[PDB]
Structure formats: C-alpha cells, structure tokens
Amino acid sequence: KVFGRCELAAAMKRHGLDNYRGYSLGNWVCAAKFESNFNTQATNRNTDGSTDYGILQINSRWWCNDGRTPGSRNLCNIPCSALLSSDITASVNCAKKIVSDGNGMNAWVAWRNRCKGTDVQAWIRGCRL
Ligand code: NA
C-alpha cells in the first residue's frame, strides 16, 4: 500500500505513535517518507546481507525474522513479511521497541540525516488529526 501523507499520519496516531518516546507525529511521517516513500512493500538489501522491510525500513539484523540473515535476532518476534502489510500495526509495534532501544530515532539513519532538527511539523500541516 502507498499511503498518502495525512492518511499515514492518521494511521500512526491511531496506533499511538504520536509523541511516542517524545517524538511528535511529524518525526514519524518524515522518517517514513525518506525510508519507504510511504510504501508498505518497500524492501532494501544491506551490504551485510540483512534486509530492511516496510514503511519504516525495519532491519532483519535485530528486529524481524527473514530466515536469510545469519547470526541475526528477531526482537519484535515477527516474520519480516508482516512489516510489508497494508495494515501498519506490526511496523508500529516494532518501531516502538526500536525507538525505546536507547538512541531514539537515530536508529533510522535517514531520520538523523534528513528529518532531525528540520521543520518536521510540515509533514502533518493541513491534516485532519
Ligand atoms: Na533476524
């Protein structure tokens, strides 16, 4: 599924991501924009052979099982495929564990490089929320 900007902002709020670990909804929408362009089916292969899955490009190295990432963990206790669903529940639940892991949203390198410190509220500007 390719979300619209305000459509994703509303789905993230419904699932309690808005101000989760003190990150305003614009931070989550910005990170999703640059990780997946709002596409739930987005995948990216890393040089290390791990893979990033879904709207927030969650990595098989730690967070989900894809059966093809030697030595990896599955800390969200999900198959990585669950992160590609039109329903964002698994991605949101798993992102809550990631952002709680100690480095906040720096876990998403694209958030650090493209969202951090920027006018992230522009990402929810005009949305009925
Ligand atoms: Na894994």
Annotated binding residues for substrate, as ranges?
101
Q: What are the CB-based long-range contacts (under 8 Å, 24+) for 64-71?
A: 64/94
Q: How many Cβ atoms are within 10 Å of 46's Cβ, its own excluded?
A: 13
Residue 128 CA, ligand 1 centroid: distance in Å: 37
Q: SS3 for 66?
A: coil
Provide CB contacts within 8 A for 77, sequence distance 6+: none
The catalytic site residues sit at 35, 52
CATH class of 1-129: mainly alpha
Would you give the distance in Å from CA 55 to the centre of its chain?
5
Which residue in the block uniquely carries the two structure tokens 């990033």?
52
State the greatest distance between any 2 C-alpha atoms of the chain, in Å, as a whole number. 45
Smallest Cα–Cα separation from 21: which of 117, 104, 111, 129?
Answer: 104
Tokens of 113: 């490089």
Query: Which value in Å is the resolution of this experimental model?
Result: 1.6
- Per the CB < 8 A criterion, the answer to whether 42 and 55 are in contact is yes
Residue 62 CA, ligand 1 centroid: distance in Å: 5
Residue 123 CA, ligand 1 centroid: distance in Å: 31
Tokens of 22: 């003190």
Strands 51-53, 58-59: pairing kind = antiparallel
